[PDB]
Design a protein that fits this description.
The complex is a heterooctamer, with two copies of chain A (about 110 residues), two copies of chain B (about 100 residues), one copy of chain C (about 160 residues), two copies of chain D (about 450 residues) and one copy of chain E (about 130 residues). Chain A has about 110 residues and is mostly loops. Chain A is about 0% helix and about 10% strand. Chain A has strands spanning about 15, 25-30, 75, 80. Chain A has a two-stranded antiparallel ribbon with strand order 1-2. A two-stranded antiparallel sheet of chain A has the order 3-4. The chains are: A little secondary structure (about 110), B mainly alpha (about 100), C alpha+beta (about 160), D mainly alpha (about 450), E alpha+beta (about 130). Chains A, G: Its main location: virion. Chains A, G: This is Head completion protein gp16.
Chain lengths: ~110, ~100, ~160, ~450, ~130, ~100, ~110, ~450
């Protein structure tokens, strides 16, 4: 199947800057390449309610990847996206990271 | 799957563990003459009957184990399908159904 | 004794350029609320800031008035206007102190005239309020000068009669 | 003759053919056939250690031969030699040795082996014959005549005077057999026989005598080399082999092969010890191990066996040895008679005498020729006819004789005379006298 | 003098927000903005019962921010900083020469309903006024 | 699964417990000659029939046991699939169906 | 499958909590020693209702999850999330604890 | 001869071949075959303790031999010796011992073993012959002549005069057998025989006599060493083995192997005790243990057995011993006649006499030569022919004789004379006189 494999998706971290200040000119770093199977939670696509999935962050699951998860940007194929969550090893022979929960959930002020 | 995945698989990961486990039962039991099931070198061999059970069980067990690879908290159950009624049915188990 | 209060505002605080009457009879609308004078503070985030409660003016008109047409011409260019107000109380032409106050163009319903003379009422109301602002500058200038302006140079010449 | 040349001759010829016979006589080799073989990874056939070998000799063969010799001769009525000198010896002897010698010489050659037989001079100097295993030697002609083979030397090693294995070789010479020590390579003057001692293998009366032919002339004797003794033997040996194997199979069949598919049980080190102690068989795992058990086909095997045996039977020996249908044949004579076991032997025995019976006679005359006395064929001389004999006639005749004597009609004596037991009528006369005297 | 510079301070305000690492992530927004639904704690931000009113006028010179929070995301962060600075500044009346300014007015209201039964949320409203109108 | 998981598994965790339990029934029952089912060393052996039942049951039982590893409060049932109708069907159970 | 894991390298993790007053107390809370796993409620992803769930915390299931769960910030894989719940070990041959409950309540004042 | 040399000779030669015969005579070893073997973890074959061994001797063999001796001799009509002195002894004796001795000597050698037989001097000094098991000794020549073997010494150990096991060795000398004590290593003057006593093995009349040949000359006798006694024996022993095994199998088959796949039951310590007490068999677990039970194939085994036996049969002994078809053979004579069991023995017995019958005669003459009287062959002297005999003739003849006497035609007396029972016509005369007197 996968075999010793990269996804292959290269992962890089994107930060506007490393400092207290945020925004402003942005620098890029390649934290590391990592492979993950990411399908956005993006609604189950049962779409029973089909209201969700809203969340601002995107949930990505990357096996045994500390790095990929939040406080690091994730890149796929050099594409850049940022996601938030908390890594988890839901299952698999090897622990595979996952993102739990969402932010800015239902109900708004 | 991936080689890494294979490595991740416990059975694959520990050749020794898997390898060792069978012969404990096997070595004494079979004849045992012993029908040597071993080279002079002492390379281990595994019984057919043991092998069938062991392989089937082991293959399932890893699948059951996950993680990847494992049933979801809400998921269909790998367990039911893989676990032999059938293989148990194989060898009968009663066998030569009658005596 | 020459009693006259001219109407004059080009645009800048008090207009700084005289125009001849109608005469502002007298009045102060308010100035209770803050009221905003030119607030002087340092290290402050001036407040309430650009707003005015309002202004009140009463006017009298005489048979001969001039610059009415001019005003319209002035109007065409259009701009914010800040008039002078002059009180009585021993206001000499030279001597007289004047309060800039603030002015609003908008309200002049009509002019009514008695046979002897026509009287007009104009009130200056500032539109507000903004709680946040900021003129910033203009009223600050207005007050500063308003403390003591340059007074009614023209009227000194008058009172010939 | 240089040693090397003599030695060289020895090596090339292959020991096997006599050896097989020699070994055969002692016994056929069960071993090769008997043991089962298994196939290794190499797949080269290796004989299993486990299988033991059993071989047996055949009783039957020995009996036949012994009987044959006596029967065949029938004891000659008389023997004569043309030559007076020879005759003088002959009359006294009468054979006595001579007939035996003739029988022995022919018989021995006919006997198993030789294949190549070399006479050796006895210490006594009387002809002694001993048979040694083949080298086997290569036929060669020591003498100029290529065609003739003076002898082919053979060496055999026996352990041991020393008790340490040594090679041994003996040169054989026409005059006599020679024994050589391998280590020395020769003992005594090799070149000389000689001259004496050793004494000549055979000596003429009063003088040394030479055959004029030097042993040994190889015996084909037939392409088969089937005969004479081997004639029985070869068939017999095969018979033994088959029989022996059969017996072994029976034992093997009986003993037990449980074989268990399952189940352990402990590792065999433990298993053996406990198993021996328990001396009980239980099945671990699922109960019962059919395991075949050994075989369904075993019964079928018997069928094969019968078929095999049946095939064997047609060719088979196991002579009927059935009692004769013919009545008469009174028991005592019957036992000797029935084979018994004259018939088979006799034919060959006759073969021994003839062909070559005439040759022997001629040779005998030749001996006379050696004498230098005028040679008459011994048949001519008496004249004698052989075989008259008639030993066989005696059997039938005697019965008549019994009647004849009793009747007294005839002969009686002449009937005796036929042998004659004795010419003298006197024996008859005595009875007559007795009768006259009586009573 | 302050003039535009005072406006500049707002720029400074922007800077601090960016300067806030957690500030990027939420960004602030969640729970505020959609994702209110997302699990408690959830805090939103926005005016209370605010609908645009008045026309052809500024909403007000002063700007007021209403905070409605569950899980109390940050009354504290704003409040603490403001309080400390404010406290030092206060104890002195706010006045300008020749002018008087007042902070008007104080309204306090709090209502909490918890469907979840989570501890009651508290709502704090803060109003800021800059400059006179 | 993981070795730790294996350890976590009760059966694995207690070799002794699992090991001991079978022979109580086994030791007396089988022949018992005893068909020793034991080394001279006394290493234990387990009957085929016992083994099949025991192994199947034990393997299931642990699975049933969980925890991990166990059915969810709302879950499909591991129980139904694994528990032999089939294995019970093995050995018939009636066996040589008939006598 | 997972087998014993390498994972534990200890990060204090940082949180600021309970600033009653301007003076604040800051604790570095990373309860986790063992890396831990979070099984997101993450909504069923049936989402039949699909209204839920945006948990303030993240419900987690870990072996020795009990320690892991709330009243300390947990970092997984360097990604940081906070969760609330009273841990219990649901099951597993090894006890696996999970975070129970999610703040805040669905209904808000 | 140095002791060591003598001793050395003993060791190398292998005891087995005689030993097997010696053991064989007592009985064949069932044991090795009989016990079943099992395969250990090592897989080395180990015989099970449990199997017992049974072996039986064969009745048949003994009977044959005894009958054979008497029949063969037929009792010579007369024996004579050429030498007067010998003759004088001969006439009186007439054999009396001598014929027996000749028969015994030949017979014994023919008899099982020896393989190597050494005569020992009796205390009486009359020839006594005893047979001892093989060392077996190595043939060697004590005397200078390599070819001849003076004797090969053997030692055997018997326990025990002491009652403690001791090795025993006896040197044997041509003059007489020697007995040595192992512990001493020698008793009496080893070097001397001697001189007397011990007394010579055989003594000449009036003087010590030496054979001139020293015992013992090894008997091949044939490569098989099948004969003479062994001839029956070897076949017989095998026969016994097979038969014995068969019987055992039957017993084994009967006894019972229930074997139970299941079910316990209690641990065997408990199980045995209860089981014995219960003395009942029940099946635990599922009812019934077919368990094979032992075997389906057992029946097939019988088929194999028949096949095996059948194979055995063809080669097989179990002499028919069927009644003779031939009529006559009146019962009394029949019983003796039928084999009975003359026929088989007789042929060998004849073998005993001849070949070598002539040799014996020559030897006898040689004995005369020893006498130094002129030697005539005993056949020549009388002259006698052997065998006339005719014992066999007697059977047929007597019947004629009965008629002859009754008829009186003839002889009668001469018919008697054929034996003669007696020459004297007088017996006939008496009848005649009686007739004349009558009545």
């Amino acid at each position: 199947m996968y075999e010793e494999f990269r996804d292959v998706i290269t992962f890089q971290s994107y930060v506007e800057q490393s400092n207290g200040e945020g925004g402003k000119t942005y620098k890029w770093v390649d934290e590391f390449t990592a492979a993950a199977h990411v399908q956005p939670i993006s609604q189950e696509e049962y779409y029973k309610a089909q209201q969700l999935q809203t969340p601002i962050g995107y949930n990505i699951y990357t096996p045994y990847d500390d790095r990929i998860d939040k406080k690091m940007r994730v890149i796929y194929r050099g594409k850049i996206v940022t996601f938030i969550g908390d890594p988890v090893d839901l299952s698999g022979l090897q622990e595979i990271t996952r993102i739990k929960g969402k932010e800015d959930g239902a109900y708004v002020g | 799957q991936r080689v890494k995945r294979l490595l991740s698989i416990t059975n694959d990961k520990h050749d020794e563990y898997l390898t060792e486990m069978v012969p404990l039962l096997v070595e004494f039991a079979k004849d045992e003459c012993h029908n040597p099931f071993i080279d002079k070198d002492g390379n281990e061999s595994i019984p057919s009957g043991v092998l069938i059970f062991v392989a089937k069980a082991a293959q399932f067990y890893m699948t059951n184990a996950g993680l990847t690879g494992r049933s979801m908290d809400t998921v269909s159950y790998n367990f039911a399908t893989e676990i032999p009624s059938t293989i148990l049915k194989k060898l009968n188990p009663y066998r030569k159904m009658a005596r | 004794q020459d009693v006259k209060y001219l109407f004059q505002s080009i645009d800048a605080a008090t207009g700084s350029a005289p125009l001849f009457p109608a005469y502002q009879t007298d009045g102060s609308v308010s100035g209770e609320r803050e009221l905003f004078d030119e607030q002087t503070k340092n290290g402050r985030i001036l407040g309430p800031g650009s707003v005015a409660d309002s202004g009140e003016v009463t006017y009298y008109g005489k048979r001969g008035d001039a610059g009415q047409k001019a005003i319209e011409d002035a109007y065409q260019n259009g701009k914010q206007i800040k008039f002078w107000r002059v009180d009585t109380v021993k206001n000499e032409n030279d001597k007289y102190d004047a309060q800039f106050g603030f002015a609003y163009i908008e309200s002049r319903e009509y002019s009514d005239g008695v046979e002897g003379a026509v009287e007009i009422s104009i009130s200056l109301q500032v539109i507000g309020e903004l709680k946040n602002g900021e003129i910033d500058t203009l009223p600050e200038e207005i007050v500063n000068v308003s403390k003591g302006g340059y007074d009614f140079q023209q009227p000194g010449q008058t009172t010939g009669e | 003759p240089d040693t090397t040349m003599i030695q060289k001759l020895i090596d090339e010829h292959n020991p096997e053919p006599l050896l097989k016979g020699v070994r055969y006589y002692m016994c056929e080799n069960d071993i090769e056939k008997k043991r089962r073989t298994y196939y290794d990874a190499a797949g080269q056939q290796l004989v299993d250690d486990t299988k033991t070998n059993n071989r047996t000799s055949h009783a039957w063969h020995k009996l036949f031969v012994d009987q044959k010799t006596q029967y065949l001769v029938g004891e000659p009525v008389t023997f004569t030699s043309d030559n007076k000198t020879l005759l003088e010896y002959v009359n006294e002897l009468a054979d006595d040795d001579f007939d035996d010698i003739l029988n022995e010489t022919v018989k021995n050659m006919s006997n198993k082996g030789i294949e190549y037989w070399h006479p050796f001079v006895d210490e006594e100097g009387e002809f002694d014959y001993v048979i040694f295993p083949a080298e086997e030697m290569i036929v060669v002609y020591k003498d100029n005549t290529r065609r003739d083979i003076l002898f082919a030397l053979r060496y055999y090693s026996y352990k041991g005077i020393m008790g340490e294995e040594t090679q041994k070789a003996e040169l054989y010479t026409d005059t006599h057999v020679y024994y050589y020590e391998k280590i020395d390579g020769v003992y005594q003057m090799d070149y000389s026989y000689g001259e004496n001692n050793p004494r000549p293998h055979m000596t003429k009366g009063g003088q040394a005598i030479g055959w004029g032919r030097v042993p040994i002339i190889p015996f084909k004797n037939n392409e088969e080399m089937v005969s004479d003794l081997k004639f029985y033997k070869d068939l017999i040996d095969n018979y033994d082999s088959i029989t022996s194997s059969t017996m072994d199979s029976f034992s093997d069949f009986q003993q037990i092969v449980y074989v268990l598919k399952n189940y352990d049980g402990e590792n065999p080190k433990e298993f053996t010890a406990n198993l021996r102690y328990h001396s009980v068989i239980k099945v671990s795992g699922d109960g019962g191990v059919d395991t075949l058990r050994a075989e369904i086909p075993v019964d079928s095997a018997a069928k094969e066996l019968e078929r095999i045996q049946d095939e064997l039977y047609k060719s088979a020996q196991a002579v009927d040895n059935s009692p004769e249908t013919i009545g008469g044949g009174a028991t005592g004579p019957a036992l000797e008679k029935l084979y018994a076991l004259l018939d088979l032997k006799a034919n060959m025995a006759e073969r021994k005498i003839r062909a070559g019976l005439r040759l022997f006679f001629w040779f005998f005359a030749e001996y006379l020729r050696n004498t230098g006395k005028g040679d008459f064929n011994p048949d001519k001389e008496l004249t004698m006819t052989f075989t008259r004999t008639r030993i066989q006639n005696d059997s039938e005749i005697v019965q008549s004789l019994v009647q004849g004597v009793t009747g007294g009609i005839m002969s009686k004596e002449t009937a005796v005379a036929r042998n004659p037991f004795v010419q003298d009528p006197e024996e008859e006369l005595a009875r007559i006298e007795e009768e006259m005297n009586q009573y | 003098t302050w003039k535009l510079a005072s406006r500049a301070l707002q720029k400074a305000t922007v800077e601090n927000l960016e300067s806030y690492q957690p500030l990027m992530e939420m960004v602030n927004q969640v729970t505020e903005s959609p994702g209110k639904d997302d699990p408690y704690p959830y805090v939103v931000i926005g005016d209370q019962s605010s609908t645009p009113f008045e026309t052809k006028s500024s909403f007000g010179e002063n700007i007021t921010m209403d905070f409605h929070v569950w899980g109390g995301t940050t009354r504290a962060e704003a409040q603490d900083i403001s309080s400390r600075v404010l406290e030092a500044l206060t104890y002195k009346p706010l006045m300008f020469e020749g002018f008087t300014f007042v902070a008007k007015k104080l309204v306090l209201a709090q209502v909490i309903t918890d469907t979840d039964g989570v501890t009651k949320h508290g709502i704090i409203k803060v109003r800021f006024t800059i400059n006179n109108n």
